[PDB]
Ligand binder design. Sequence first.
Ligand code: CLA
Ligand code: CLA
Ligand code: CLA
Ligand code: CLA
Ligand code: CLA
Ligand code: CLA
Ligand code: BCR
Ligand code: BCR
Ligand code: LMU
Lengths: 312, 41, 220, 227, 86, 213
Amino acid sequence: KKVKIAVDRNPVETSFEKWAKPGHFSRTLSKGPNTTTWIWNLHADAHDFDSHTSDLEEISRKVFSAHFGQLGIIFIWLSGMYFHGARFSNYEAWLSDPTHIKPSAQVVWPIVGQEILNGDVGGGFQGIQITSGFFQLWRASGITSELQLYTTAIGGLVMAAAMFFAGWFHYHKAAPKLEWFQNVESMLNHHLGGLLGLGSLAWAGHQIHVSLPVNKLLDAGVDPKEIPLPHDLLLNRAIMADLYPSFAKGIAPFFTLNWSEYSDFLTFKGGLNPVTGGLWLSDTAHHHVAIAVLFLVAGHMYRTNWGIGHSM
Amino acid sequence: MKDFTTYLSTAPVIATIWFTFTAGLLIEINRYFPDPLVFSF
Amino acid sequence: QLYVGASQSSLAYLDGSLPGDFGFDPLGLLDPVNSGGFIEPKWLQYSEVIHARWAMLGAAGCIAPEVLGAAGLIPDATNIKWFESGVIPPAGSYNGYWADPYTIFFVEIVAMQFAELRRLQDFRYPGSMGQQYFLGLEAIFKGSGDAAYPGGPFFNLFNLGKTEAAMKELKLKEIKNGRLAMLAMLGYGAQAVMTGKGPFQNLVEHLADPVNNNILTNFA
Amino acid sequence: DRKLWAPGVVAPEYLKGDLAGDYGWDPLGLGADPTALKWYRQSELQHARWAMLGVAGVLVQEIVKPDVYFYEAGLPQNLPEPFTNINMGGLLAWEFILMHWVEVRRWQDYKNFGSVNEDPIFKGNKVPNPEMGYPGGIFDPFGFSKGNLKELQTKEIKNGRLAMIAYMAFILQAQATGKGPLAALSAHLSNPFGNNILKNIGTCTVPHSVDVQGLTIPLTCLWPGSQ
Amino acid sequence: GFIGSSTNLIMVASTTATLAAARFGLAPTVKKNTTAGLKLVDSKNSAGVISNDPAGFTIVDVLAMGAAGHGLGVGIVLGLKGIGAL
Amino acid sequence: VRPVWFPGNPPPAHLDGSLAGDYGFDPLFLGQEPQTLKWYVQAELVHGRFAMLGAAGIILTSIGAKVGLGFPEWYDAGKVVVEKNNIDFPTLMVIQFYLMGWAETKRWYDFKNPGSQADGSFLGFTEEFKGLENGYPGGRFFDPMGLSRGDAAKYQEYKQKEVKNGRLAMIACLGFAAQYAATGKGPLDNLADHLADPNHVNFATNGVSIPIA
Ligand code: CLA
Ligand code: CLA
Ligand code: CLA
Ligand code: CLA
Ligand code: CLA
Ligand code: CLA
Ligand SMILES: CC1=C(/C=C/C(C)=C/C=C/C(C)=C/C=C/C=C(C)/C=C/C=C(C)/C=C/C2=C(C)CCCC2(C)C)C(C)(C)CCC1
Ligand SMILES: CC1=C(/C=C/C(C)=C/C=C/C(C)=C/C=C/C=C(C)/C=C/C=C(C)/C=C/C2=C(C)CCCC2(C)C)C(C)(C)CCC1
Ligand SMILES: CCCCCCCCCCCCO[C@H]1O[C@H](CO)[C@@H](O[C@H]2O[C@H](CO)[C@@H](O)[C@H](O)[C@H]2O)[C@H](O)[C@H]1O
């Protein structure tokens, strides 16, 4: 077949000997510095992988593993934000009174008089009023606790370790061949159907089962400690049916094409929630379901290994 | 690990370590001896 | 090839030399050409056999308490659905073990760490595990050239499959029962999620009124 | 080694029938080391002989006096009249010293074979040693050896394996149904379908602890369940 | 009762229609692609795949046309539910 | 060939079966350089000897406090000692650092210069401070019984026993620390609590070690 997994086994030795030789990637920098222009060129040419070599296979392998590094770093950054919201935050206080409490997730150490930046943001808390929108995003996801943010941070660190391992693996241990990267049809099929289709479908599911009930109870004045945890909504269909009666019917209306039964949590209200000033999360869930279907059909467009599909 | 310690002896790593050290020393001096406008002790 | 879904591309490397080689490799994962990592044919066959043995232990263990309590041979306290045994405490847990599930889980960690890392070291270095002292047990841990079939004095305890054709037939029976049990475990999970009841309870309810107890009628 | 433990198995190449009761079993390969095989044969003989004595003792103790539980006969308040409520410390001292002597002698016979044969006080008397584990002489006073020794060793080790199994059976039955061997057999014969390993496994009749003249012996069962 | 409904019959009709269109040379299949002008022409199949049918109708074809017919029938059902014709 | 920490895994080339307690355990390759490996060998031996002393002292004082003698726990003995005896903790600490600095600088400058420390500069002591091997000083002062001298196989067996009991005592002191941080009580209080109910009383039933439950 033409679309297949193709890799070189152990192409590059994992060794520190090239860390100790700055400018190894270049033939014009491996000769060592004589001028400082060398010190600048070592950094300008570090990621110009097409000027290190000229064959597309090693370039593509370097690119793939560097993308894995970037993803690991983004995961470190996300885990850091979630952790600072779990440890150095006024988030649990902000849920109870979001209209008066300033979101803050960064506390400053009192060292050189800079504890003045730890301002009176609210919630019996002193810190830097953040502008990232992470509190609103977490309330939309239905967090309602610092423990969930802490465990999201731990998961993000695990995923960062996974990404860095994957970069090391896909460069040093089993690096894909060039013909694997040039499967743009399969790459697009998977990135539309899987990355965006299954991703939007999974987020729609989270919103059906976690975000919508948690935020419907939050908008009903229920204190976040009285709100059922997401797994109690997953397990007990009676609670969800009490919030959204269509859950009493199960997933039968989906398979019987009686989709209008789901108009309780799959809406087209448009506008804004008058309690929060944000979008209706039922509209958002329906949106993500719709674009999930759309991307999943879009990811069946290109021809990979069977006769159906398109050759771009 | 001769090559790893050669890497740690590189200009950027040594600079990072040395300036972390200097900044931490100054920060601890300013924590234990706060607000030193003049040499009076 | 047999097993509809097989392809001329998959039959290029599926010679029929592996147990359960029915040509079904539509995604072409057993192609040895330019395939390393864990998509190596050796590792994939090994993992199929391992998932098979674990899964046909589990396909019997998820059904056995319910069947033995239906027969009245075990008391009703141990007659439980497999997911309310302590494996998924939210779905339910059993209170009457000799220890709490995490003590037993640490015992499991140590035991299975030992066992599975011995297994791994014999996969990575086949000639190993018969070389270092293990309380005399290293005489049965010599294994074979194949990792999924060590077949020493313990792992082949009754020396079954003495000829090559008998061993091949037995490997085929093993992998077929194991694929069946892997599907049975996937079905156990799917039925526990959908119906919320045990696999034997689902079987009984389908055998009583099949037209009104099926995957379609259980969507509600 | 002929007529092995299973119809289709092969004997390991270190079990060739030179030991008595050799069915070539060794599925864990523990006897692959000859040193360990010698030591394990000695431990097999020890467990076998002590278990033959043990089943004989439990049986004859239930037959002579069924008044007393063998699981509780070690308690000092259940001891015969010349020894009732005896101090278990001095008793344990007697046993400890008198068994340390003989077991260290046996162990030195294992280490240096044929070095502790002579009496150490009256140095005119030497126990023989045809094999390690079979001293003879004062230990074979009736002289049943110097005849078919291999056949008698086979009989010994077979009855000893059986007695090991049987004594662990006694212990587990006493832990499950709280009865002795013959008591359990008669309780089975009384109702051989409502009194068996079913409806009796899962319940341990052994207490959580037992006070013995001040000490508290922890008193476990061999499996979990019901106190 | 769903079996016998208008929805059920619409769906089975759509799926069988797409399956019969592909099997009998009225829809692109694994073995027959279309050109820029929609004329069915033999494809290269990119793997080669075995089927004992007289027409080379794969289970990949059954999957493709079941998905196409399910989309068709879903759209038809929900559009007749939309205009009130169901 | 030789027992390895991870059976099947070949040992690294820098860990030949020559040092005591050599099981080929160097996943981070920290002792790949020979001089660094000598330094780490002496570090392991010093750590393990201090940890053997510490485990023995903690165990003995815990036995004494458990049977009822006048003993505090290891986490309370410093305060009890400096307050029962009117001992100035600064004075004690600087005396300790003076003496241990003398001793450990002698150590350091015998490591840097093995031929050193035996010139007779200290008090005329020449051969009492020359050192037999790296980490094994020996002599009439550090080995008064002469157990390194005489039987060599016994000396190698003793080196193995020393390094292994030292690693075990390091693990034991780490365990004392973690057990105080978790259970908040002494080591033999922990042991008695475990021997009381081995199940339901272990690290899985503190809520500290396993926070899942
Ligand atoms: C997906 C994003 C992406 C990717 C993968 C690349 C990748 C690449 N670019 Mg492109 N580029 C991008 C985005 C991207 N770029 C954007 C957004 C711009 C506009 C700014 C450019 C503009 C650009 C130019 C103009 C050039 C490249 C070049 C390159 C190549 C080498 C770059 C290198 O070695 O720098 C290594 C990294 C550095 C030297 C670090 C730069 C640090 C910046 C200047 C400071 C900013 C840091 C921070 C945000 C500020 C606060 C810092 C604090 C300490 C004060 C490489 C193929 C070069 C090339 O191909 O040469 C032939 C080249 O000439 N890129
Ligand atoms: C310890 C593990 C390890 C080791 C020994 C090596 C060893 C090697 N790698 Mg591999 N690699 C690893 C892990 C490892 N890699 C991982 C985890 C990845 C995934 C990202 C890769 C991806 C990778 C690629 C894609 C390439 C290598 C290359 C190399 C060679 C030299 C690299 C070099 O000069 O390093 C020294 C370089 C660094 C120390 C830079 C690290 C930068 C990190 C990843 C990002 C940090 C960003 C930071 C947060 C920014 C802060 C900004 C600041 C202002 C705050 C050498 C054989 C190169 C080669 O030519 O091999 C033949 C090559 O092209 N490796
Ligand atoms: C990816 C997205 C996603 C996910 C994961 C879920 C998941 C779930 N939904 Mg939701 N849902 C979604 C999207 C999603 N939904 C969307 C888009 C809609 C709008 C149409 C809905 C509308 C909806 C309604 C209206 C209802 C649900 C319900 C449910 C639950 C019942 C699942 C069920 O019956 O299906 C069956 C699923 C399976 C049979 C798969 C289980 C397979 C298991 C995991 C196999 C593993 C076995 C393993 C191999 C062996 C054991 C392992 C080990 C122990 C040995 C479940 C929690 C119902 C419920 O009860 O909610 C509380 C309900 O009433 N959903
Ligand atoms: C951009 C992401 C990316 C991409 C494109 C690849 C691509 C590849 N990887 Mg790499 N890999 C990645 C990330 C990625 N990997 C990460 C993050 C890890 C660390 C966890 C690895 C670890 C890894 C190993 C160890 C191996 C590969 C292998 C492969 C090859 C075949 C994989 C395949 O088809 O199996 C199909 C995929 C599976 C069988 C995985 C199913 C199980 C996973 C956990 C589920 C997928 C995650 C899902 C999207 C999100 C969770 C869903 C869940 C909640 C339901 C191919 C070159 C193999 C190879 O041939 O070597 C190159 C191989 O041995 N990869
Ligand atoms: C029906 C399922 C099945 C089948 C056909 C096989 C078949 C085979 N296995 Mg696999 N295996 C299975 C399940 C199965 N196994 C499971 C669940 C496990 C995990 C516990 C294993 C673990 C395993 C290992 C580790 C090894 C094998 C080996 C073998 C081969 C040797 C012959 C054999 O096992 O007897 C044929 C099987 C049967 C007749 C099945 C009978 C099923 C009954 C219920 C079992 C008897 C129960 C009884 C109480 C067992 C204890 C006896 C005694 C101690 C009291 C053969 C290919 C060995 C091999 O390939 O060496 C060359 C080998 O090394 N298998
Ligand atoms: C010297 C060995 C030793 C011994 C005999 C004990 C004995 C005991 N411990 Mg302690 N403990 C030890 C080491 C030891 N511990 C170490 C090293 C730690 C730190 C991880 C702890 C932390 C600890 C806690 C937090 C608790 C106990 C408790 C207990 C008691 C019950 C057992 C238990 O909960 O499991 C604990 C058993 C272990 C942690 C395993 C033993 C040590 C392993 C084998 C060390 C392995 C190191 C490995 C070889 C190399 C590491 C590097 C590697 C990761 C790359 C029991 C008296 C509990 C108690 O107080 O009982 C009431 C309790 O709550 N222990
Ligand atoms: C936030 C975050 C995090 C977490 C995350 C998560 C948690 C995620 C999840 C995710 C998920 C959890 C996902 C899931 C998914 C699922 C899916 C995607 C499903 C699908 C399904 C389907 C597609 C179906 C199909 C079908 C049907 C419909 C019926 C039957 C047949 C079939 C099967 C074909 C972390 C830690 C990382 C850190 C960072 C951030
Ligand atoms: C054997 C045979 C036969 C018969 C056969 C048959 C009967 C078959 C069937 C087949 C079938 C019966 C198939 C089916 C398929 C289906 C499918 C494949 C489905 C799919 C689905 C989907 C894909 C979905 C999608 C979606 C959703 C989910 C939502 C909405 C949107 C959309 C639509 C996208 C004959 C002729 C006789 C002869 C010989 C051979
Ligand atoms: C393939 C895509 C899905 C992948 C798997 C999805 C992850 C599911 C995680 C486990 C969730 C367990 O919960 C899921 O099964 C339970 C058992 O029937 C259902 O529980 C429901 O049925 C039970 C039995 O009648 C009753 O307690 C209630 O009616 C109700 O609680 C939940 O309504 C459902 O959400």
